[PDB]
Amino acid sequence: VNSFSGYLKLTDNVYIKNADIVEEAKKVKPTVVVNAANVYLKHGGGVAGALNKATNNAMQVESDDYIATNGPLKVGGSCVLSGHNLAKHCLHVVGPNVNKGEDIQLLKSAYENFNQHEVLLAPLLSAGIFGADPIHSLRVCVDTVRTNVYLAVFDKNLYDKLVSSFL
Numbered sequence: 448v449n450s451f452s453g454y455l456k457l458t459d460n461v462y463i464k465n466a467d468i469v470e471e472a473k474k475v476k477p478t479v480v481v482n483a484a485n486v487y488l489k490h491g492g493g494v495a496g497a498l499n500k501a502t503n504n505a506m507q508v509e510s511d512d513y514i515a516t517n518g519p520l521k522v523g524g525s526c527v528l529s530g531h532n533l534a535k536h537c538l539h540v541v542g543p544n545v546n547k548g549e550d551i552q553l554l555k556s557a558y559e560n561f562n563q564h565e566v567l568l569a570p571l572l573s574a575g576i577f578g579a580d581p582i583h584s585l586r587v588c589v590d591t592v593r594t595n596v597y598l599a600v601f602d603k604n605l606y607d608k609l610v611s612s613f614l
């Protein structure tokens with residue numbers, strides 16, 4: 448038993464809710480919140496900009512030190528950093544950005560990072576400003592992630608389309 452509430456169950460291990468991931472994280476304080484990161488950990492907009500804003504820019508400060516030490520992530524890769532006031536940990540995961548011409552096949556590799564964590568609160572990778580089809584992103588999630596994932600979908604219209612079209 449965990450504290451996630453109001454989710455629709457899609458599969459044995461995947462759950463989905465129309466929710467603002469920032470508000471959801473503030474309420475649950477999950478062990479892991481997933482950020483929709485880019486390789487530079489520049490948290491300007493989308494989910495990343497919202498999560499970083501909620502930490503009063505502490506996420507960005509930590510991220511800049513990480514990059515200065517380690518260099519950029521790979522597309523499809525991840526790193527574990529602090530969750531600040533939102534979660535114990537933040538798993539920064541880089542899905543391919545279609546608006547940068549990155550290979551969508553890398554979306555499966557991005558989701559594989561979730562399997563290193565027993566339970567996660569997450570957005571749909573590569574959705575939103577990353578330019579992929581969220582229905583496709585949900586399909587890859589269900590077909591790749593084996594650990595327990597609670598997906599937060601900000602847009603109500605999109606949430607209903609994702610549920611109604613789910614196979």
Ligand SMILES: O=C(O)[C@H]1CN(c2ncnc3[nH]c4ccccc4c23)CC12CCC2
Binds near residue numbers: 570576
């Ligand atoms: O579900 C989805 O449809 C997308 C929505 N996105 C976002 N994109 C741009 N700015 C944003 N600010 C936010 C503040 C709080 C929560 C989400 C966002 C967000 C990201 C997304 C959450 C799952 C992937």
